[PDB]
Each structure stands twice: as structure tokens, then as C-alpha cells.
Write a protein that binds this DNA or RNA. Structure first.
Length: 60
RNA sequence: GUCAAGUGAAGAAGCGCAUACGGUGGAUGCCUUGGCAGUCAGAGGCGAUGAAAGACGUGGUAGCCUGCGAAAAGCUUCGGG
């Protein structure tokens, strides 16, 4: 959520957090191109989660 | 059981008229998400903080409309339920 992320972590700590779920976005674009992705709810979920951490950085 | 003479109903290839059913065709009837003109109020401007108008892109699958713009049918906050 957003109330979790405003707990301070930092500029760097949340800046490390973005490079984590870009991996999880990458792996879900590889499995979809191949035959093995049933959880289609996961694919439209990390798009709405990268957007949160970019919001809490361009503002504070 | 005979000839001669007189007379002339049927028969329709196909058509005409009337009715009875159909086919084609989309009128009439009834109906409206759309318009049309007024009355009374607003508000009369938008743009170098990048406009009016668009191209391309965005959805778990596929074209087009409606929304948005690599943070892309959304993100954070207050308020109403």
C-alpha cells in the first residue's frame, strides 16, 4: 500500500525496491510469451505497483 | 333392317374475366436513445507553466469507439456513500 511506503524507508531504500519488481515484471512478460501463465491477475498488478513507488519519490 | 338430303354437341396448343390461396416488395399504423425553435439563468474566453486540432501507443485474448500517455481504461490525497 501507500501508507506502508511513506514510513520513511528512504530515497535509497525505496529506490532499491523498484529494481526488485522490475524483475517480477520481466519474468511475467517472459512466461506470457511462452505457454505458461495462468495467473493473469498478477500481470496487471505489478503495473499498478510500480506506479505507487514512482509517486512517493517524485513527491515526498 | 338399306342410301340420299338437311342439321351440328363434345375436343384448347395456349390465352381472357372473377374468386381462393401464396411469393416479391416495402408503403400505411403505432413507437422513439435524435433533432428544432424559444423562455429564464449562467459565463464570455484558451495559449510559451506549451493551446485549438491530431499521429502513434496503452486491455489476460482480437478489430473499432470512449478514456488515458512509457507512472498509459490509471497513481496519491482530502470529501460524499
Amino acid at each position: 500500500k501507500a501508507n506502508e511506503l511513506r514510513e520513511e524507508k528512504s530515497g535509497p531504500v525505496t529506490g532499491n525496491n523498484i529494481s526488485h519488481l522490475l524483475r517480477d515484471q520481466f519474468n511475467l512478460r517472459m512466461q506470457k510469451a511462452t505457454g505458461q501463465l495462468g495467473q493473469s491477475h498478477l500481470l496487471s498488478q505489478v503495473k499498478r505497483d510500480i506506479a505507487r513507488v514512482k509517486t512517493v519519490l517524485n513527491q515526498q
